[PDB]
UniProtKB/Swiss-Prot annotation, chain A:
Stated name of the protein: Spike protein S2'
Annotated phenotype, changing residue 51 to H: In strain: Kappa/B.1.617.1
Higher taxonomy: Viruses, Riboviria, Orthornavirae, Pisuviricota, Pisoniviricetes
Protein role: Subunit of the fusion protein that is processed upon entry into the host cell. Mediates fusion of the virion and cellular membranes by functioning as a class I viral fusion protein. Contains a viral fusion peptide that is unmasked after S2 cleavage. This cleavage can occur at the cell membrane by host TMPRSS2 or during endocytosis by host CSTL. In either case, this triggers an extensive and irreversible conformational change that leads to fusion of the viral envelope with the cellular cytoplasmic membrane, releasing viral genomic RNA into the host cell cytoplasm.
Effect of residue 7 to I: In strain: Gamma/P.1
Species, as recorded: Severe acute respiratory syndrome coronavirus 2
Disulfide partners: 12-23, 62-106
Annotated glycosylation sites: 54, 78, 114
Length: 127, 49, 48
């Protein structure tokens, strides 16, 4: 139990862990040690998501005939337009070429839909 | 059978909080991203997996 | 052994683990526990 305690003083307090149910339940933020007789009392600051909402997804989008893949994030939709946001939070943005990756054609990936990829360089060179 | 469910069904988020809805073809793409494999490998080779 | 068996549920099963030769040989994806008498049987999915 003390070797389990000396690990969690090293891992949870002195550093950041990605682990589940080691530094406490949920995503680890930080840990606060406290003094205790014949032991130690840990205060685990945890990151818990609360409320959920169902969105419409797709693995890839199709524009010119080449398949577009996300770099870091998810594909969401409100039922009308396709939006891009990250995995742990919802911050909807337009789909840009810097936020996507181009590999393959549209005849491979099952579930690809037609979309319009916004190029930021096209209004910049025309103005 | 509840833990064999939510590994396939709910992803990795059932023990870390409330269970999200992630479909299973997108779950293996994020597990490739932790070991350094981009999503080009999964979606092309999916019939060979 | 049960403290190691509770560690494999918290690491190899409920999340993604980047460890080497903890969750099995190679890069780790996910783990499938099975019911067993006086123990537990793990089915690991590895990337070789």
């Amino acid at each position: 139990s003390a070797n389990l305690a000396a690990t969690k003083m090293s891992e949870c307090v002195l550093g950041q862990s990605k682990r589940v149910d080691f530094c406490g339940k949920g995503y680890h933020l930080m840990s606060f040690p406290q003094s205790a007789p014949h032991g130690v009392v840990f205060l685990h600051v945890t990151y818990v998501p609360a409320q959920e909402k169902n969105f419409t997804t797709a693995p890839a989008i199709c524009h010119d005939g080449k398949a577009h893949f996300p770099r870091e994030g998810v594909f969401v939709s409100n039922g009308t337009h396709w939006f891009v946001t990250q995995r742990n939070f919802y911050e909807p943005q337009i789909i840009t070429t810097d936020n996507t990756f181009v590999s393959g054609n549209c005849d491979v990936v099952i579930g690809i839909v037609n979309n319009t990829v916004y190029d930021p360089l096209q209004p910049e060179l025309d103005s | 059978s509840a833990l064999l469910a939510g590994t396939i069904t709910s992803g990795w988020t059932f023990g870390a909080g409330a269970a999200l809805q992630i479909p299973f073809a997108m779950q293996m793409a994020y597990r490739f991203n932790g070991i350094g494999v981009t999503q080009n490998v999964l979606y092309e080779n999916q019939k060979l997996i």
